[PDB]
């Protein structure tokens, strides 16, 4: 109880100065126990949905319904804001693996839309979430419209508990084959967008795989698998929405949650 109470306390106090709502899930794989703050509240996913999207691609690969080497051609009209890799390959296309890599490690938005188009879109991804036992998450829109984060709007949302359970299932559990779960871990570990969030707050000896999300109405998120030194892995989800402090402070709040998980 003391660890649960202490973390819930530190989250309430951070949330008070942020102006918004702070949701935190910490799943300790040694025990199966989950602690945190606002565990069952709804938060906009923003780019955190891309972990589920890459997971569904790999689950389809496991079933011979998709091939990581399949090439996708696309047009300039498919490009949306924040597409650093896909904007360079309009002429030559990208493989499904390259699109997953760009969606996870750079948060490339067109790459994620092309993955959504490969498997039935937002409704197809939501059906995959239901297959993991997740009755909470729902994706409704594609990039960039899903980042609106309107107050109280349930579209494009998850909960800290639901996403932590899904991230555990896809990386450490058995939702994916051993080859596919290792590939997803590799992409998460190679993420380039998380240096000011959980990675900045956890002890430097820990290994981190993560996916960020950022959106309107003061929304900043980070979800991660954390490997401590001589302690079982943790799954940590952090969702901040409705923050009214400046963006740099939202990043610091997430880093400070990372520090609280470790301490």
Which spans of this chain sit near Cl ion (rule: CB under 5 A)?
Answer: 134-136, 162
Beta bridge partners of residue 21, listed in sequence order:
241
Shortest reach from residue 136's CB to Cl ion, in Å: 4
47 carries an active-site annotation: yes
Nearer to Cl ion, 136 or 193 (CB): 136
Toward Cl ion, which CB reaches closer, 64 or 76? 64
Instruction: Please state, in angstroms and rounded to a whole number, the distance separating the CA atoms of residues 206 and 199.
Output: 9
Phi and psi, residue 218, nearest 5°: 60, 50
Report CA-CA distances (Å) from 172 to 157, 192, 235, 245: 23, 22, 9, 35
Q: CA–CA separation, 252 vs 254, rounded Å?
A: 5
Nearer to Cl ion, 61 or 106 (CB): 61
Give the 3-state secondary structure of 35-63.
Answer: EEECCCCCEECHHHHHHHHHHHHHHHHHC
Q: Which is nearer to Cl ion, 158 or 196 (CB)?
A: 158
Tokens representing 185 are 């871990």
Task: Specify which residues 226 forms β-bridges with.
Answer: 208, 234
**CB 104, min distance to Cl ion, A:** 23
Query: Which residue's CB is nearer to Cl ion, number 127 or number 232?
Result: 127
Task: Please say which residue, 134 or 210, places its beta carbon nearer to Cl ion.
Answer: 134
The C-alpha angle with vertex 105 and arms to 103 and 108, in degrees rounded to 5, equals 35
Q: Tell the smallest beta-carbon distance from residue 25 to Cl ion (Å).
A: 12
Q: Reduced to 3 states, what is the DSSP secondary structure of residue 2?
A: helix
Closest approach, Cβ 41 to Cl ion, in A, equals 12
Residue 211: closest CA among 77, 34, 55: 55
- The catalytically annotated residue of 1, 31, 47, 73 is 47
* Residue (of 29, 44, 193) closest to 105 by Cα position: 193
**Cβ-contact 152, 146 below 8 angstroms:** no
- Provide the minimum distance between the beta carbon of 113 and Cl ion in the complex, in angstroms, as a whole number: 24
Residue 131: CB minimum distance to Cl ion, A: 8
Query: Is residue 113 helix, strand or coil?
Result: helix
Catalytic residues: 47
């Amino acid at each position: 109880s003391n660890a649960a109470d202490a973390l819930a306390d530190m989250c309430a106090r951070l949330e008070a100065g942020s102006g918004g709502r702070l949701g935190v899930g910490v799943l300790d794989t040694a025990s199966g126990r989950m602690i945190g703050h606002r565990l069952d509240d709804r938060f906009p996913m923003c780019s955190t949905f891309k972990v589920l999207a890459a997971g569904l691609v790999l689950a389809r690969v496991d079933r011979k319904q998709e091939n990581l080497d399949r090439r996708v051609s696309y047009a300039k009209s498919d490009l949306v804001t924040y597409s650093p890799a896909t904007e360079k390959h309009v002429e030559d296309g990208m493989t499904i693996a390259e699109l997953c890599e760009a969606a996870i490690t750079l948060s490339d938005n067109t790459a994620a839309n092309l993955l959504l188009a490969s498997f039935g879109g937002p409704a197809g991804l939501t059906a995959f979430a239901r297959s993991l036992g997740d009755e909470t998450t729902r994706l409704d829109r594609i990039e960039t419209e899903l980042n609106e984060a309107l107050a109280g709007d349930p579209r494009d949302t998850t909960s800290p508990r639901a996403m932590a359970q899904d991230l555990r299932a896809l990386t450490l559990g058995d939702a994916l084959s051993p080859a596919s779960r290792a590939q997803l871990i590799t992409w998460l570990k190679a993420n380039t967008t998380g240096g000011t969030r959980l990675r900045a707050g956890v002890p430097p000896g820990w290994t981190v795989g993560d996916k960020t999300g950022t959106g309107g109405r003061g929304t900043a998120n980070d979800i991660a698998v954390l490997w401590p030194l001589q302690r079982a892995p943790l799954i940590v989800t952090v969702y901040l929405t409705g923050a009214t402090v400046v963006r740099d402070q939202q990043n610091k709040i997430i880093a400070d949650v990372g520090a609280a998980v470790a301490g």
